[PDB]
Amino acid sequence: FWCSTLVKGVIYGSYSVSEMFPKNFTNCTWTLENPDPTKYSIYLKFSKKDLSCSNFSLLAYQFDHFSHEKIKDLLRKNHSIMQLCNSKNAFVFLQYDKNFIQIRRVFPTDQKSFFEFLVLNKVSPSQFGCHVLCTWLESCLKSRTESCGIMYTKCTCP
């Protein structure tokens, strides 16, 4: 019953939660498939400007054994499933590294929100890739002192 969206083969992606899923659909999930779990890693950066948690909720998790048809089952198992509603700051930078990544928008049973992802080669990152990595690194730095380090990549920049 859940509607799916499989986006794969891209480097950088910026989206709004309204585009992916409307309020008409009760529960749906958005999926990312890292092109190569060995050559590339995922860095996530979002911005929830007055996110509405009362109406719907958002969850994020990693999966590897083609288990997006058993999501509720996974919800019972708690396989690295984390919410982002209680997060203090909007500028969260979750970095992942698994074959598949699923973000579930679930009704309890919208341009203001923004989501962004990047793929980074663990050896030789591209110039633009690292460069925007630095950009949101400085965005995290400017904010308090948040833990913006998160295994700083080899990327070197001013």
Binding site: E33, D36, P37, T38, D64, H65, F66, N99
Partner: protein, 132 residues
């Protein structure tokens, strides 16, 4: 006269003692490999050649054992080992005299398998050389 050849890359990771299920079949003349049971029901007796390469799950597990087994007898094995948890191929190539109806399949003896969905890293491919 018989013409049988097959080549299947691995799609999903398999952990624990089990028969790895190779699903991304690229070439399956003769249709003697069923991805469902990860087996090679040899209908045509003769001599076959099977090679297999299995990647180690990076970051989880250090030493994974793999064994190509005909019926219940282990005819070949490999051991991928790396303390730093990096990747390392467990690979082998064998020539077997398969009888009528026997089944040859990979059985991971401990360790965690790694299998790009379409990067076709871990492969299992065989073909018949002579017909009895």
């Amino acid at each position: 006269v018989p013409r049988v050849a097959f080549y299947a890359g691995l799609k999903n990771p398999h952990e624990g003692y089990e028969v790895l299920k190779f699903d991304d079949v690229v070439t399956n003349l003769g249709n003697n490999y069923d991805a469902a049971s990860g087996k090679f029901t040899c209908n045509i007796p003769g001599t076959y050649f099977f090679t297999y390469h299995v990647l180690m799950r990076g970051g989880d597990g250090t030493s994974m054992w793999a064994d190509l087994c005909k019926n219940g007898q282990v005819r070949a094995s490999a051991i991928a080992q790396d303390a730093d948890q990096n990747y390392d191929y467990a690979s082998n190539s064998v020539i077997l005299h398969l009888d009528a109806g026997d089944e040859v399949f990979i059985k991971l003896d401990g360790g965690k398998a790694h299998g790009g969905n379409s990067n076709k890293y871990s492969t299992f491919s065989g073909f018949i050389i002579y017909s009895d």
